[PDB]
Amino acid sequence: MQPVREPSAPKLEGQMGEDGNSIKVNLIKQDDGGSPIRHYLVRYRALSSEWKPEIRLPSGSDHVMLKSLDWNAEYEVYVVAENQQGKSKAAHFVFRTHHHHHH
């Protein structure tokens, strides 16, 4: 267990949820550390929405698609990886869409 370094923070490309009420954030797809990731945990909150505690994902998930979040208002997302020996540093991003205005 000792030579296993913890995983690196998850990757974030901020791929806009054109789908509406949702968004796509990239996920680790390889062994960043000393052992592969086991699970992923995502926590997010919006201006009008609660801090969802965890969105589960398995090690073999290239991305995570979140939903039940504000789209016409601002929201924040935190995501971490959990490998068989420890956890990754959190990565976080903030987003809002549908902010088009007449010009």
Structural method: NMR
Sign of the Cα pseudo-torsion (30, 92, 53, 86, in order): positive
- CATH number of the domain where residue 73 is located: 2.60.40.10
Count of the separate structural domains present in the chain: 1
Domain range for 40 is 1-103
Contact 34, 3 (CB under 8 A): yes
Tokens of 99: 């902010």
Give the closest residue to 5 by CA, choosing from 40, 52, 37. 37
Find residue 28's DSSP bridge partners. Answer: none
Tokens of 89: 């540093």
| CB neighbours of residue 46 within 10 Å | 19
- Percent helix, strand, coil in the chain, to 5, is 0, 40, 60
DSSP string, 61-98: -SEEEEESS-SSS-EEEEEEEEESS-BPPPEEEEE---
Kindly give the pairing relationship between strand 75-83 and strand 91-95: antiparallel
Q: Helix (H, G, I), strand (E, B), or coil: what is residue 101? A: coil
Q: Helix (H, G, I), strand (E, B), or coil: what is residue 46? A: strand
